[PDB]
Design a protein around this ligand. Structure first.
Ligand code: NAG
Lengths: 27, 257, 10
């Protein structure tokens, strides 16, 4: 759907999960 | 998942559990891709060497879960299946080529803080993100170690596990195994020189390998946990169904039905 | 091992 891939408890509230940044750092 | 950690609440709201009605057991993971469609590995549903050929009525999908074993009343949703679609060119006899299946739910599920679909990749997202060295994330309730008579202690997790793993160059994947690999697979895991641990394992099949796009802030499903040899072994990598390569088939099924 | 789910499911 139009809203795919955006998590209610994270992206939608501008919060990061504990190991998210590890992914971004690798890109 | 071997050498992962407990998931946070709501961390993977597309994660689905495929649950056998009788006997009660965890069959596989899967992923929610819209309000009525779930994606998984074909071999979770059909694998003749292990006498597996399930029909729609044998299975339930449980969405929104964290605990492996509890019935998470007013948190999870349990749905029945209307139809199973296996890729017509799925090869169970040799190497699990095209290890992909779709399941249509009898009724749409309502989204919540714990239930939300993942995106499927377009060509530019796949080319941008499916590169060696880039990390993706795998989730499941599968075994914590490779099954072995010498293991001591708990073999299954209490809650959903998560591990982040790098994509590996194709030639390295190819040289790591004698199983014939195809363009419909990719492998991920740490290389021997990195000296780190982490893998999927039995019971994690069907679950998603996801990546986050920095270009639009969204999570994409790039892979499906498919196969490996042992779990977390030195010089081995886990293998995943290449979702973008098979996207034309997915789109055909969803549009048709 | 698993907690019983409601029999309406099934
Ligand atoms: C799978 O079972 C269905 C009935 O559900 C049957 O028509 C089909 O032949 C079976 N396939 C295999 C490979 O056993």
């Amino acid at each position: 759907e139009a809203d795919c891939g955006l998590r209610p408890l994270f992206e939608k509230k501008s919060l990061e999960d504990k190991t998210e940044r590890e992914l971004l750092e690798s890109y | 998942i071997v050498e992962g950690s407990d998931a946070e609440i709501g961390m993977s709201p597309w994660q689905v559990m495929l649950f056998r009605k009788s006997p009660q057991e965890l069959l596989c993971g899967a992923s929610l891709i819209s309000d009525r469609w779930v994606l998984t590995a074909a071999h979770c549903l059909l694998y003749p060497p292990w006498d597996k050929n399930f029909t729609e009525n044998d299975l339930l999908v449980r969405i929104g879960k964290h605990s492996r074993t509890r019935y998470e009343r007013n948190i999870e949703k349990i749905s029945m299946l209307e139809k199973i679609y296996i890729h017509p060119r799925y090869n169970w006899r040799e190497n699990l080529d095209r290890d992909i299946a779709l399941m249509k739910l009898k009724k749409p599920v309502a989204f919540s803080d714990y239930i939300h679909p993942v995106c499927l990749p377009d060509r530019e997202t796949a080319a941008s993100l499916l590169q060696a060295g880039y990390k993706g994330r795998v989730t499941g309730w599968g075994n914590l170690k490779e099954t072995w008579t010498a293991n001591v202690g708990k073999g299954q997790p209490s809650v959903l596990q998560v591990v982040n793993l790098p994509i590996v160059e194709r030639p390295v994947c190819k040289d790591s195994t004698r199983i014939r690999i195809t363009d419909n697979m990719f492998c991920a895991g740490y290389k021997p020189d990195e000296g780190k641990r982490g893998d999927a394992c039995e019971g994690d099949s069907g679950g998603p390998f996801v990546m986050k796009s920095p270009f639009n802030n969204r999570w994409y499903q790039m892979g499906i946990v498919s196969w490996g040899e042992g779990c977390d072994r030195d010089g081995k990598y886990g293998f995943y169904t290449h979702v973008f390569r098979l996207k034309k088939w997915i789109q055909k099924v969803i549009d048709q039905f | 091992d698993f907690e019983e789910i409601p029999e309406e499911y099934l």
